[PDB]
Amino acid sequence: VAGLTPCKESKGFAKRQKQEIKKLEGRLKLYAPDSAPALAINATIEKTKRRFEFYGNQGLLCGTDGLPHLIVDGDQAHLGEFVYPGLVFLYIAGWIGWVGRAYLIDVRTSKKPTEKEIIIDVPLALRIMSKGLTWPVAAIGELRSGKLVEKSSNITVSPR
Amino acid sequence: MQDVKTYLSTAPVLATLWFGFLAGLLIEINRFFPDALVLPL
Amino acid sequence: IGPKRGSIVKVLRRESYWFNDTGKVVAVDQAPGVRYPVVVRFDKVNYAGVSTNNYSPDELEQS
Amino acid sequence: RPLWLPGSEAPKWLDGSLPGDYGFDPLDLAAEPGRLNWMVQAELVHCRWAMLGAAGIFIPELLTKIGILNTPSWYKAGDATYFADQGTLFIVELLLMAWAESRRWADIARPGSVNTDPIFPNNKLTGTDVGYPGGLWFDPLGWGSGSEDKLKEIRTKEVKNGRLAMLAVLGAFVQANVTHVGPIDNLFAHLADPYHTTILQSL
Amino acid sequence: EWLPGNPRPSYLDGSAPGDFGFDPLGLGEVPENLERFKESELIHARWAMLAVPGVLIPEALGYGNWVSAQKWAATPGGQATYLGNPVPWGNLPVILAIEFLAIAFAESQRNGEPDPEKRKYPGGAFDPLGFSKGANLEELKLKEIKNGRLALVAFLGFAVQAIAYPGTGPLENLKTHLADPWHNTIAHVIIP
Amino acid sequence: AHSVKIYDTCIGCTQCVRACPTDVLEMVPWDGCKASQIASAPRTEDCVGCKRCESACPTDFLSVRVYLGAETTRSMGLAY
Amino acid sequence: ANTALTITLSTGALLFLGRFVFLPFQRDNVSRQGLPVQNGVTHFDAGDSRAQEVTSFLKTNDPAGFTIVDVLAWGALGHAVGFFILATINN
Numbered sequence: 001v002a003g004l005t006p007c008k009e010s011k012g013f014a015k016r017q018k019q020e021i022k023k024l025e026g027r028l029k030l031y032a033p034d035s036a037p038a039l040a041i042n043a044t045i046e047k048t049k050r051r052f053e054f055y056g057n058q059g060l061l062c063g064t065d066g067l068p069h070l071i072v073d074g075d076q077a078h079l080g081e082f083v084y085p086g087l088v089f090l091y092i093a094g095w096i097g098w099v100g101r102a103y104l105i106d107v108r109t110s111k112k113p114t115e116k117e118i119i120i121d122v123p124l125a126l127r128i129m130s131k132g133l134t135w136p137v138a139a140i141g142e143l144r145s146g147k148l149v150e151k152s153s154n155i156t157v158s159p160r
Numbered sequence: 161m162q163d164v165k166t167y168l169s170t171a172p173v174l175a176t177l178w179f180g181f182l183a184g185l186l187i188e189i190n191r192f193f194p195d196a197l198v199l200p201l
Numbered sequence: 202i203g204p205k206r207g208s209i210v211k212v213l214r215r216e217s218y219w220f221n222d223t224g225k226v227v228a229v230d231q232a233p234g235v236r237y238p239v240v241v242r243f244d245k246v247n248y249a250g251v252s253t254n255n256y257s258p259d260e261l262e263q264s
Numbered sequence: 265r266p267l268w269l270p271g272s273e274a275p276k277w278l279d280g281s282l283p284g285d286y287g288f289d290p291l292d293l294a295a296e297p298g299r300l301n302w303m304v305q306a307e308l309v310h311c312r313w314a315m316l317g318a319a320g321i322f323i324p325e326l327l328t329k330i331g332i333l334n335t336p337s338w339y340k341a342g343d344a345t346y347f348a349d350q351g352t353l354f355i356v357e358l359l360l361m362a363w364a365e366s367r368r369w370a371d372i373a374r375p376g377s378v379n380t381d382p383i384f385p386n387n388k389l390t391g392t393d394v395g396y397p398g399g400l401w402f403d404p405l406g407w408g409s410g411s412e413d414k415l416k417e418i419r420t421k422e423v424k425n426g427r428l429a430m431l432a433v434l435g436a437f438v439q440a441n442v443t444h445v446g447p448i449d450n451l452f453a454h455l456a457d458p459y460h461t462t463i464l465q466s467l
Numbered sequence: 468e469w470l471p472g473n474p475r476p477s478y479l480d481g482s483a484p485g486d487f488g489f490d491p492l493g494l495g496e497v498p499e500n501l502e503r504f505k506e507s508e509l510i511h512a513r514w515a516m517l518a519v520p521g522v523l524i525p526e527a528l529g530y531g532n533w534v535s536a537q538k539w540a541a542t543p544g545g546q547a548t549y550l551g552n553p554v555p556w557g558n559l560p561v562i563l564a565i566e567f568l569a570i571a572f573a574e575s576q577r578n579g580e581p582d583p584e585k586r587k588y589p590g591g592a593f594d595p596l597g598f599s600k601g602a603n604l605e606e607l608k609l610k611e612i613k614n615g616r617l618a619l620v621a622f623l624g625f626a627v628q629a630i631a632y633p634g635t636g637p638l639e640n641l642k643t644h645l646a647d648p649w650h651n652t653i654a655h656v657i658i659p
Numbered sequence: 660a661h662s663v664k665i666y667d668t669c670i671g672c673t674q675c676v677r678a679c680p681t682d683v684l685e686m687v688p689w690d691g692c693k694a695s696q697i698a699s700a701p702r703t704e705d706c707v708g709c710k711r712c713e714s715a716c717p718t719d720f721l722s723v724r725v726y727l728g729a730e731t732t733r734s735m736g737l738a739y
Numbered sequence: 740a741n742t743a744l745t746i747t748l749s750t751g752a753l754l755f756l757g758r759f760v761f762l763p764f765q766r767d768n769v770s771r772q773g774l775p776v777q778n779g780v781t782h783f784d785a786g787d788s789r790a791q792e793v794t795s796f797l798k799t800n801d802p803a804g805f806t807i808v809d810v811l812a813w814g815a816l817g818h819a820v821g822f823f824i825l826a827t828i829n830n
């Protein structure tokens with residue numbers, strides 16, 4: 001796909017694993033083998049070897065630079081590069097957008113609506129932050145019932 | 161607590177407590193699950 | 202004159218900040234010759250910081 | 265009536281008429297007027313597809329463990345060959361699902377409209393309530409009619425057996441994803457060492 | 468009555484032949500657009516019902532499908548074999564200039580009718596057998612659009628079978644389907 | 660120089676005159692408000708154009724309005 | 740090949756379309772669109788002496804109103820099609 005070799009069989013990706021441990025191994029040569037800063041570089045090497053063995057096992061595509069490239073078209077092999085964490089993101093981002101929208105409706109029908117935005121009512125906030133879990137069923141539910149959008153006759157419009 | 165919790169519910173304190181929890185969570189995700197470029201699930 | 206005191210009106214004036222906005226009537230002047238007798242109070246201020254403005258009955262409808 | 269949470273106020277929309285009502289709408293997914301008519305029809309197909317799902321996931325796998333059917337596992341049943349192509353059987357299903365669900369779609373939208381036959385109109389369905397198509401094709405024994413207190417109990421028994429099957433089928437799905445073992449063998453591996461075969465050990 | 472229980476819209480009352488109320492997107496909502504759509508649905512269908520015998524009967528008699536009998540014009544020499552016989556006047560500039568003259572004279576004379584009903588069904592010279600001046604008139608117009616929409620769906624089938632399976636024709640798609648019908652369907656096109 | 664125009668939305672609150680630093684505006688009698696007075700700009704040739712009157716006008720939108728036109732030594736604010 | 744027959748037949752086909760087929764289509768459109776109009780008046784009516792529509796050049800003796808401009812328009816398409824055909828054949 002797109003002229004990119006897989007990273008498990010890429011010679012450039014294995015070259016970057018070789019020259020990263022060798023950079024960290026030469027950093028280890030000036031420390032005692034049981035010393036505290038040498039345990040951090042030894043944990044860095046095992047973090048590096050975990051990283052390169054994770055990138056090759058996920059079917060990542062590596063170019064001529066030896067670097068893993070993401071295919072965001074919507075490929076059946078490449079769902080976890082953009083499509084799977086994008087749907088994970090939009091669920092979380094729609095959770096932020098739904099509990100901030102539902103908080104403003106809950107404080108617009110209050111005695112002092114502007115004091116509830118500088119001082120956020122946490123019992124009112126936390127009872128709808130739980131309610132933002134099921135938000136695609138509540139956003140399209142408000143879209144189908146007409147409560148999501150406001151009619152243009154009740155919207156402040158600058159003159160022509 | 162009729163006014164101490166009101167101060168604790170203000171916009172800068174609740175931004176500090178949420179983003180302290182938010183960056184506290186995302187750092188601790190990045191410790192046990194580091195170098196995460198591809199979601200496997 | 203005016204719609205009603207203490208009623209909810211919507212502003213039809215194009216150049217006001219509160220165009221297509223819900224406002225509450227607080228005073229209507231019954232003296233003849235006054236161009237903008239209906240005094241409408243709004244929950245939100247404009248850029249000048251005021252919420253009190255005078256409109257004609259032709260620039261308001263009951264909502 | 266009993267509720268899902270003692271000491272919690274029941275929502276104003278779930279008033280207790282609906283069979284299976286335990287005041288369980290914490291996230292307010294059926295608040296809106298006219299919305300609870302759609303969410304019962306959604307619950308009824310999902311509960312009946314899950315009881316159809318649980319009878320095809322657990323019962324042939326249990327009888328495979330006894331060994332009187334030798335049926336393959338349900339998560340490997342899509343790889344099994346038949347007299348038809350597996351891709352072909354998808355589209356023949358959704359042409360038949362285009363008929364059966366759109367007749368069901370008009371019943372939710374316009375109740376009392378599609379109880380008559382499209383071909384031979386003397387054959388009419390005897391169901392009166394929305395979501396309960398009584399007739400010779402669906403209720404040949406006539407168990408869907410009687411007193412309203414008697415009818416509420418058997419409608420309560422559909423959804424309580426149905427919500428268990430939904431949880432069941434959702435359980436088999438995640439079990440086959442992280443353990444890759446069929447769910448009757450997951451039960452039999454839990455009656456041997458229960459404290460070592462747990463969701464934390466299977467991650 | 469394209470959906471039992473569905474409310475038919477106000478611009479589709481049922482008095483039209485074939486008025487089954489099928490307009491979910493509301494394309495015929497404009498009244499003057501809807502009068503053009505009724506004379507467009509019938510010319511299309513009548514060309515489609517002149518096309519289904521023009522596809523199957525050349526294929527069933529063995530002179531190829533409607534694609535391989537059409538590729539001769541792109542070839543510098545194709546000689547225009549008709550019923551197994553090459554016509555002498557079958558050159559691409561010859562048969563296109565006649566088609567851009569004879570059909571254009573036919574379509575310009577068709578568009579010249581001011582009556583919005585004689586544009587639909589003209590009669591007279593176009594009805595020499597006198598079935599329009601008979602006892603049944605409404606059900607034959609319902610017969611026109613039910614046969615016409617079937618051939619309109621058929622020509623849509625005809626076209627997308629050639630895109631999905633190039634080099635084969637609709638009776639050859641029928642002969643492929645008649646051998647092993649549970650393996651070779653639209654799912655071969657949907658699922659590659 | 661500058662053209663200062665008063666519109667009929669004025670309530671006669673007088674604060675456009677009080678904010679004026681070059682004595683352009685004055686309050687004349689009128690019949691279109693409760694205060695029975697409207698502003699006017701007779702000495703509009705003395706207008707610097709600072710729009711302090713527009714900053715002090717509480718009417719939405721503004722009743723006093725200053726249009727920056729041809730600028731002379733009055734409206735440039737020079738002492739040399 | 741055959742330049743003298745291909746050009747003549749293709750010009751004669753487009754002139755047959757211009758006189759007998761598309762002449763009610765062209766005469767209706769030059770009356771529905773009309774003269775070009777700026778601000779409610781014609782360009783010649785607004786003061787442009789060079790925008791006057793010529794009538795001596797448009798004075799036709801054809802009974803259907805087919806003038807020498809339509810000869811120069813439909814015959815130009817018959818040569819554009821005629822040299823489309825001759826270039827396609829000679830390849």
Ligand SMILES: CC1=C(/C=C/C(C)=C/C=C/C(C)=C/C=C/C=C(C)/C=C/C=C(C)/C=C/C2=C(C)CCCC2(C)C)C(C)(C)CCC1
Pocket residue numbers: 750754810811812813814815818819820822
């Ligand atoms: C029948 C008749 C008649 C006659 C007529 C005639 C004879 C006509 C002719 C006509 C003609 C004779 C015409 C022509 C025309 C032509 C033209 C008009 C041309 C043009 C051309 C063009 C323009 C072209 C172009 C081009 C070029 C140049 C180059 C490049 C390419 C092209 C091709 C594009 C009469 C009157 C007696 C009357 C009676 C009847």
Ligand code: SF4
Pocket residue numbers: 665668669670671672673674675676697698712715716717718721722723
């Ligand atoms: S400040 Fe504005 S409202 Fe007040 S008197 Fe001057 S012009 Fe009128």
